[PDB]
């Protein structure tokens, strides 16, 4: 079954999107149709996975003869699946036998006839609470268009035999012929491996039927469903023949254009006009200048003065293709807290052709750019910052990528004064340097690293999180790994690299509970019990 996602223009667009449509994945909205312009523009539709909004319809007859069940994955306003109102004499909704989720709205249809006698109790299921059916089993058109009463367990509309292999429209999903309560699970549990495994027989979900691979431009989501596009919290990434909707690593890539290229081609600084076009943005393509005229405000550019609290919109920028020049920052903030999350300033375009990160003439105590790792092309100048201290400590050769990259860290607070004032890097920071005054803002660590923080020693023997040192990093053990005091409590990450288990242990793995009821091989549920030794034994 093919699937689909002025008065004349509306009619043309709707006839274009719904002509061949057989199952409507979104909501079929039939609104604003002029008189005597509809001719079988949508007749074969058989399941609309959403709401049918047939409102303000001047045409006399909207056939929709074959729509069998309108899913109701949405609603019109609230519990509103079929919205026929404010239109239309004949609507022979002959085939619509169940609207699973939602209700039917009748109002402002003086011309609609023979539909008030449709036994809508069969059509709607348990959502009669908002069933405003106020505006003999027959949907109109004389005879042969009868309501076909059938209701007044994987079959929705009706049955063509006492077999789940032959049913009109399946309630939840349909693998190939039989109506299943759910898709064949993507990952299958094998007691041999004691872990979930990709099931060859499993199929991803495309709407109301189960599909081994999602055709066209459909991306597999986390829940196995193949949505048209990834959600806001996910990104599109291809690993196999079908792409998957991988969850975003914090703010996902939203390439914006910076000041100088694009809509901000002629903008001067990151003005109050420019800002809020960069909200939730990462990998800004172009420069990202913050000149003082941003904070003063400008009249010949007619841009209101920038409130300092809005510069925190730029905290999401995790990469810059051009240059990052921060030539004035709010005087009440002690560290460049807007650019804390920057990772690479690739610097393809440079300010005056030279500098790729210039922090000139600000009053910040510490540069506070803890996360910057590569400043690829241009130089880096940090000057004038008359209160900047923990600055020269970081080894400027390590981050920059091309050997000609320089640094002109000048005219900042003197090193002798920086140390005399008690402003030196915390002890838990390797001799590489430190971005500020705190342990988190350290270039590299002496011993361990509990995330960004550089701790004195991983909780190898004593601690609440019970780290296990790895590649000079503290990695929280899996919660099932109970802390052991005589030795380390976990050799490595995961549930199968820990000595003592707080909960039961299933094979090599330690889990909260033994696997019970989980889908396993041969489409058979698996249940496991625990012995006195917290070992999970297969039943």
């Amino acid at each position, epitope marked *: 079954k093919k699937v689909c996602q002025t008065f004349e223009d509306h009619f043309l667009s709707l006839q274009r999107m719904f002509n061949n449509c057989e199952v409507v994945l979104g909501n079929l909205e039939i609104t604003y149709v002029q008189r005597n312009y509809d001719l079988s523009f949508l007749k074969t539709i058989q399941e609309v996975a959403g709401y049918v909004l047939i409102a303000l319809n001047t045409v006399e007859r909207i056939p929709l003869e074959n729509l069998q069940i309108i899913r109701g994955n949405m609603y019109y306003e609230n519990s509103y699946a079929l919205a026929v109102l404010s239109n239309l004499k004949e609507l022979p909704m002959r085939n619509l036998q169940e609207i699973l989720h939602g209700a039917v709205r009748f109002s402002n249809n003086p011309a609609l006839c023979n539909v008030e006698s449709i036994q809508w109790r069969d059509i709607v299921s348990s959502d009669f609470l908002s069933n405003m059916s106020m505006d003999g089993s027959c949907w109109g058109a004389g005879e042969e268009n009868c309501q076909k009463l059938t209701k007044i367990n994987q079959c929705a509309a009706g049955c063509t035999g006492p077999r789940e292999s032959d049913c009109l429209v399946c309630r939840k999903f349909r693998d190939e012929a039989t109506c299943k309560d759910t898709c064949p699970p993507l990952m299958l549990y094998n007691p041999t491996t004691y872990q979930m495994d990709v099931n060859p027989e499993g199929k991803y979900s495309f709407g109301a039927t189960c599909v081994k691979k999602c055709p066209r431009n459909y991306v597999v989501t986390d829940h196995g469903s193949c949505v048209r596009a990834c959600g806001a919290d996910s990104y599109e990434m291809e690993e196999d023949g079908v792409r998957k909707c991988k969850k975003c690593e914090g703010p996902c890539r939203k390439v914006c254009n910076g000041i100088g290229i694009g809509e901000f081609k002629d903008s*001067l600084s990151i003005n109050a006009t420019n800002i809020k076009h960069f909200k939730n943005c990462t990998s800004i393509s172009g420069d990202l200048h913050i*000149l003082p*005229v941003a904070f003063r405000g400008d*009249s*010949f550019t007619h841009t209101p003065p920038l409130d300092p609290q809005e510069l925190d919109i730029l905290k999401t920028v995790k990469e810059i293709t051009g240059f990052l020049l921060i030539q004035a920052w709010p005087e009440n903030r002690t560290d460049l807290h807007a650019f804390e999350n920057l990772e690479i300033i690739r610097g393809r375009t440079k300010q005056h052709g030279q500098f790729s990160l210039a922090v000139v003439s600000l009053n910040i105590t510490s540069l506070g750019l803890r996360s910057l790792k590569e400043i690829s092309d241009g130089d880096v100048i940090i000057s004038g910052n008359k209160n900047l201290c923990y600055a020269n400590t970081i080894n400027w050769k390590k981050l920059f990528g091309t050997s000609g990259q320089k640094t002109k860290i000048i005219s900042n607070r003197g090193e002798n004064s920086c140390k005399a004032t008690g402003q030196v890097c915390h002890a838990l920071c390797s001799p590489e340097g430190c971005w500020g005054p705190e342990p988190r803002d350290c270039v590299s660590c002496r011993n361990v690293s509990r995330g960004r923080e550089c701790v004195d020693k991983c909780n190898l023997l004593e601690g609440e999180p019970r780290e296990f040192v790895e590649n000079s990093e503290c990695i929280q053990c899996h919660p099932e790994c109970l802390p052991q005091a005589m030795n380390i409590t976990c050799t490595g990450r995961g549930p199968d690299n820990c000595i003592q288990c707080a909960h039961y242990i299933d094979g090599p793995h330690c889990v909260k509970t033994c696997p019970a009821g989980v889908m396993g091989e041969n489409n058979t549920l698996v249940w496991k019990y625990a012995d006195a030794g917290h070992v999970c034994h297969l039943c």
Partner: single-chain antibody
Amino acid sequence: GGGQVQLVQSGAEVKKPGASVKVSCKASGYTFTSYWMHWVRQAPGQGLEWMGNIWPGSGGTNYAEKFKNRVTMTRDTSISTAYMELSRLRSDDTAVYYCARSGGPYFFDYWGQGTLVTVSSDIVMTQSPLSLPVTPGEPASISCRSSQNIVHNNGITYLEWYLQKPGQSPQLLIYKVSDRFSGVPDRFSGSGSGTDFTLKISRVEAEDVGVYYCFQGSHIPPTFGQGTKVEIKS
């Protein structure tokens, strides 16, 4: 002047028709790369007329259509001096060309001395009074009208009144429709909304005598009014 934003312009330029004149404005006391040096002209017999900006930090100049093909403005950030070359001098180009410096809530905050370039062979704002005479002490009021609504899309009306006291460069008096600049007496108090603006000087003194030029910058080419030479009735 050690710290005071003081712009000093070239001045005293005499040319011949069809030639080119280049005028500079040495900006001192401020980050010359942080404020635009907008340049405004006041022809004899006419009110102030903007002649285009330049953001000396980047050199990216805007220009006025009445000279877009004729005058070019270039910055010299190293020496802190904006420059303006007006080419093909006509007869009607003899005027005084001032170099402003558009501030945050005000345009033309601190204005240069002004260069008189004598050469010889747009939301229209008209000021309702003109050569309105008053008596020392008597309250006076000069009205000014806008061709369109000068309420900008951002919601801030860039209406202003600048008072070119005799022999002095114009200096802002009402920074927005109503707010008074810092250093102006409480006597000067503009008002208005929509399209019409009226300035009410509550007690005309000896020093307030001089042309109050109404400028509207919510339109793209900054357009001033004709300006009413308020004078003491002897």
